[PDB]
Symmetry: C3
């Protein structure tokens, strides 16, 4: 159930909270409309994560789902968060590399399906079905990582060195971090309950804070965000 993981939820809330404040207090004197975009997108990512982490700490983002033959604790807030949060990160990568609107739409589309589908799976009552949805969700993610890695990099090679290198660091961080989510999910309370909800929430916390604050820090502290 949901009680012993309260500490990882409280620390996540705190970290996202400070992360938001920090980025806010850094983009204040930014005149460049391009840089402005990056700060806008990158700052909202942790702000949203903050509200959803708080809904979990306070119990609102937790629901109970019966499957297998039991009542399981499902933190649904994560999907609400990721629904808007993952496309924003992808938007950062797209602007940095100047991606075609066509591809930006395909990624956002793929990403919405990846999260929607993941939510469905998490709330499904027939234990066996949850893994069908997991399969579909992972197929979507692979498609997004494929484009970021092979498609975007190519696009980044045409920009100046500062942009290409920063994109390369962000690229490696998101590909590695994002792929940990489906595994954590599969082995956690949403799938085969091998790992306790306690450790699971700690894993997501490290992944979420790394994928947003870390990502943001790497991006917002470089000169790439400028023209």
């Amino acid at each position: 159930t949901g009680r012993p993981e309260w500490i990882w939820l409280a620390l996540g809330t705190a970290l996202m909270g400070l992360g938001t404040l920090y980025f806010l207090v850094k983009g204040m004197g930014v005149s460049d409309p391009d840089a402005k975009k990056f700060y806008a997108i990158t700052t909202l990512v942790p702000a949203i994560a903050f509200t959803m982490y708080l809904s979990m700490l306070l119990g609102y983002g937790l629901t109970m789902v019966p499957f297998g033959g039991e009542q399981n604790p499902i933190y649904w807030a994560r999907y609400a968060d990721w629904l808007f949060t993952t496309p924003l990160l992808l938007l950062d990568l797209a602007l940095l590399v100047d991606a075609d609107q066509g591809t930006i739409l395909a990624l956002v589309g793929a990403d919405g399906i990846m999260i929607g589908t993941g939510l469905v799976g998490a709330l499904t009552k027939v234990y066996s079905y949850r893994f069908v949805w997991w399969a579909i969700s992972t197929a979507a993610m692979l498609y997004i990582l494929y484009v970021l890695f092979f498609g975007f990099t190519s696009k980044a090679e045409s920009m100046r060195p500062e942009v290409a290198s920063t994109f390369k660091v962000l690229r490696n961080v998101t590909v590695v971090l994002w792929s940990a989510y489906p595994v954590v999910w599969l082995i956690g309370s949403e799938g085969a309950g091998i790992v306790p909800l306690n450790i699971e929430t700690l894993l997501f916390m490290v992944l979420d804070v790394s994928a947003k604050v870390g990502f943001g820090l790497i991006l917002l502290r470089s000169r790439a965000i400028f023209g």
Copy 2:
């Protein structure tokens, strides 16, 4: 209830599924950013339809609603699908004709209301009220078909013949197909239960597959999508 229509749901899932694969495997070597947009938009339409048709086949997209004096089987997944799916189709028509942002916003707005309002109606408990919502939803749709037929055609007359003719075919297919939905709804399990849920699901399946795969095929196999 929901059991005998499983075959139309399974066939729809299959068809949307293959339809997605096919479009994916066709836009692969497309360099034109314009064409890229059309493939992106047109491919996501069936992909979304696939996930929602699967949620209905697996039972997740089905809920029970009391009205009249009974518990009625309401497939709510359809609205989730159409919410993002109908505006994307409209986006295809808009790009093909180069519509004003003002009008694109009015259509997407009208369309969101048409689906939201339709969802409300489907889930309302006071039998009589469901038809008030149906009335509002149909008013919205008529407004969208009006613009597509009279407004868009005019816009299409300024493009080269290939574009004008393809737009004309797509225009006639969507106007005819879309107007069948409110009728199916009115005479189906969501309204006056004249037609059984069995036949109803078969009707929607033919309409959905025609409105997306068919539409996509007509669009993606022409040279209109190019500059």
Copy 3:
């Protein structure tokens, strides 16, 4: 509970309804793509408000939430409305002043959080927590009013007099009107139940109709919306 406020809900439905019709019947012969945008955005604001006010009058937009030690009547339809309705108004102000995409994204982002967070609060079961969410929601709003007042005005000073003056009127109307919502909420049935649901619904009605129809009238009847 929900019954004696039916009259304010019926009058709101009526007013939004007529307000929509009127704007529709005024933007008909508009050729200017810019003006077209304003009519599109401004017209959908009341159209959405109409569907949500109707869902409240008909009872669908009302739910029951236990907190304090009682079952409280929570009109959740308001959030559905405002979710899309407040960002559209902000879009009007942004176009009128020609705001940077960066800032438009920050405002829409801030605004989505303000409404989402407000919804959460309204539906939370732990009485004390509802005010934490109220605090976060108000912080977001203050951030939006800050930018509109200090940021946008500056942007408006570079436009021609007609635009600057209309923006100034709209600016003062929204800053004053918007700030009344959190107070009404805090002292209404969603917070410290000082004011009865009866008077509360009357307050929101005057605020909603003023913030949309009024706003729209001031905007759509000026020459500012033109190039």
